[PDB]
Amino acid sequence: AFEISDFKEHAKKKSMWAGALNKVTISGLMGVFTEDEDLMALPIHRDHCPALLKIFDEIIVNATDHERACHNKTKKVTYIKISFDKGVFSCENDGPGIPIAKHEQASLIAKRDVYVPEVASCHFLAGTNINKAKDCIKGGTNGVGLKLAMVHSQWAILTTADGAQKYVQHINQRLDIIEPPTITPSREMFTRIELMPVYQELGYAEPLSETEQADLSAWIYLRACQCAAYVGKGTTIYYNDKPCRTGSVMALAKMYTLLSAPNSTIHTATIKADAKPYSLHPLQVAAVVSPKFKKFEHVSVINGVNCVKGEHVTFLKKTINEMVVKKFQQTITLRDSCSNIFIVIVGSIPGIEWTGQRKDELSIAENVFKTHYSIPSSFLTSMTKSIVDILLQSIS
Amino acid sequence: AFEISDFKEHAKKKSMWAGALNKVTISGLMGVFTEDEDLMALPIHRDHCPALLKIFDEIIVNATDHERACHNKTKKVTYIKISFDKGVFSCENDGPGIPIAKHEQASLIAKRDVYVPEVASCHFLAGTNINKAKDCIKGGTNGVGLKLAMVHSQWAILTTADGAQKYVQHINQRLDIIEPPTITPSREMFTRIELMPVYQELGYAEPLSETEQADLSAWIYLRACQCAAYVGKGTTIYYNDKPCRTGSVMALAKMYTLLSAPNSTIHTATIKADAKPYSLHPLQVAAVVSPKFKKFEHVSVINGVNCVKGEHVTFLKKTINEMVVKKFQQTITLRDSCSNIFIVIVGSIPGIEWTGQRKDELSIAENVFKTHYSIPSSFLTSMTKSIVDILLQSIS
Ligand SMILES: Nc1ncnc2c1ncn2[C@@H]1O[C@H](COP(=O)(O)OP(=O)(O)O)[C@@H](O)[C@H]1O
Ligand SMILES: Nc1ncnc2c1ncn2[C@@H]1O[C@H](COP(=O)(O)OP(=O)(O)O)[C@@H](O)[C@H]1O
Secondary structure (H helix, E strand, O other), rough: OOOEOOOHHHHHHOOOOOOOOOOOOOOOEEEEEOOOEEEEEEEEOOOOHHHHHHHHHHHHHHHHHHHHOOOOOOOOOOOEEEEEOOOOOEEOOOOOHHHHOOOOHHHHEEEEEHHHHHHHHHHOEEEOOOOOOOOOOOOOOOOOOHHHHHHOOEHHHEEEOOEEEEEEEEOOOOEEEOOEEEEEEEEEEEEEEEEEEEEOOOOOOOOOOHHHHHHHHHHHHHHHHHHHHHOOOEEEEEEEEEEEEOHHHHHHHHHHHOOOOOOOOOOOOOEEOOOOOOOOOOEEEEEEEEOOOOOOEEEEEOOEEOOOHHHHHHHHHHHHHHHHHHHHHHHHOHHHHOOOEEEEEOOOOOEEEEEOOOOEEEEEEOOOHHHHHHHHHHHHHHHHHHHHHHHHHHOO | EEOOOOOOHHHHOOOOOOOOOOOOOOOOOOEEEEEEEEEEEEOOOOOOOEHHEEEEEEEEHHHHHHHHOOOOOOOOEEEEEEEEEEOEEEOHHHHHOOOEEEEEEHHHHHHOOOHHHHHHHHHOOEEOOOOOOOOOOOOOOOOOHHHHHHHHHEEEEEEEEEEEEEEEEEEEOOHHHOOEEEEEEOOOEEEEEEEEEEEOOOOEEEEOOHHHHHHHHHHHHHHHHHHHOOOOOEEEEOOOOOOOOOOOOOHHHHHHHHHOOOOOOOEEEEEEEOOOOHHOEEEEEEEEEOOOOOOOEEEEEEEEEOEOOHHHHHHHHHHHHHHHHHHHHHOOOOHHHHHHEEEEEOOOOOEEEEEOOOOOOOOOOOOOHHHHHHOOHHOOOOOHHHHHHHHHHOOO
8 A cells, every 4th residue: 555656657657747737727828820921829728638738848948058058158059949840849058968977876876887967858857957056047956857758758759969978878668768879079068858748648639630730739739839029139930840930028918919909018027136046037028918818827937947826926916006006096906906917927037946846937026026126117107007097998 | 056855845935835924014923812711713913924824734734634434433532632832833633553574665864764653654655545536535645744754843842652562763853863663562542743943943932932832722722622513523633731612613703703793693504415425425614794804804724734825715605695685686796795794614525636735725627616515595685685774784
């Protein structure tokens, strides 16, 4: 009755690692769909497997982490190329590869030669963020993300090149089969992850049905677009070799409001702080205010992660509400004030935590914002004007 | 740069296991405070450490799981006794103890004698729920909760008795020191966990400040009260030897609305399903509708867990909204409809998953509810009456 699991078997069975391991209703699930030349972010009203979307997310975030790590180095990440076709998922970045070197600790443990990329891909609780600096703005921390991808893959190929050498390793059958790597001379420099998920075990058809394929493609496309607003100005994001043309919070904002409120006004702000480390990390905001928005809604990309809850949002909500209360009273709750707002927040916040491995919710003291950050008054004033206009109509 | 962690060190560093490992703002944090003979559930507007509250929760849920496991057995759980004093936390339940027996697998691994309760308390990814039945309604699943308690304890004592024997083991210094157990003859039968958290490392004063102590006590008290509404009718919950007098969703409802809306009307429902396993697990609901409630709010206790998000809520929201739309239109969005509702939902739901180890959000297909459950019409009608009254006032 009292059983002992290993990581591998536990990760295949337990929702704690990446969420539900079958299809469920995911609140606010969205994808990108192409209408003509327009990108449109649209709700996907079908159940999907959270753990499946997470494995994609884990590799995408590994790539955006490498971009942040290299942005102030000589050798940079210039591209992240994400592909999805015939059920196969791939993510490729340039910049320095994963070190092609024996890992001593790992080699002693396994009583054989294990190289760093094998530890990166097959060893649980392992990576370069195990001792994360209080100021680190990478999403990486747990040393788990890539191994979960592997464990939810029927086959996987890791390829990395360090400018001197190339390293190819096959990991198959949910991490049960770790093939010895193939190492050859090379002057290329990149890292590619390629895999086929265990769709059947995760509640999908094999191969994917038409709707499953279209939903997943739309979802991944939108994550790529979110990634492209986050990443530094020297990096291009591709989805199936097409550049993602959403390098700004404005572009995201329009894409999410194209159907609901086209030809609308976009309030913008860069939210800054005076003290390091916060002062290194401005937050870009775009917001739309429309009477045909039903409730408050936000899209957050923080430290490369598409989280759905955090005090960063609350900070904007309350600040806006305070002003909207005043200006309304003069002219004539936190929900009344904000139910017509759709807002996009993109940037880095150092020293945050999370509520789980999935990073759906960031964890922080509200007072970080009160103490350190100010929202430009022009943005507050603009938003208050538009909100109050709408409040004066319904009354009238 | 590429480090390998063990569970122990990882759990002390990483928010994925139990949430933030320092004080942060916790949305909707509440405690129970005594005003005269009245219990009052009140907001705690100070930052607290989520991981700290979780370790309490993990042991409390282990006890409520044992109550569910034994409720249809001959030897039952008749009490759960929760204590908090001088910083020391304890939880004691009767009913069958944890087996006082050598664990063979664990003994081979450690190359010595390890008994089951040591595996229960010190071995990660281990327990009786590793292979959880599709119909299991226990919160337990990960085989991690008790080990996290231990890892966040400067000292801990596990005591269990199986009617023939008693077993006492000390686990100290964040699970670094596992003392050999003391086994003696006994005819008692129970399990007690007693521990002192590492408050300093989690961002509290040592000892606790006045406000820290009062906040934590209020929080634990309220979790005990939540536990008492959940547990079977043969079980009494105690907090510091005082019975928690909240054995019904009505009592919870009043306790949460005593300050905001005393002497108010409580709409009640038992939500049932025709098909097993759902039909075994009725959901008890109490709701209050008041104009001086600012937004929609719920309190959920599901499978013994105080989760803050799930489709169970959404099911009630939408069903209520549909009716409120109709009845309003006749007389003359999902937010308008529901912003005056405060609702309590308590019961078991089989075969759910979660978004993380913390179990803040349950994961399920919305269609489970549409397919299997019906909300009694009298309750829907009552709620619609009260909601529409309030909608006709603001207009007027
Ligand atoms: N695309 C990549 N480029 C460079 N290094 C990578 C890449 N993907 C993964 N890594 C390395 O592999 C380690 C293990 O990855 P993962 O298990 O996802 O852990 P983490 O929590 O650090 O993201 C990372 O910490 C990083 O050092
Ligand atoms: N109070 C208790 N009474 C009986 N058994 C218990 C109790 N607390 C813990 N256990 C046992 O110890 C195991 C390990 O506990 P834990 O690590 O919390 O795992 P789980 O995820 O199963 O709750 C449980 O699965 C259960 O079998």
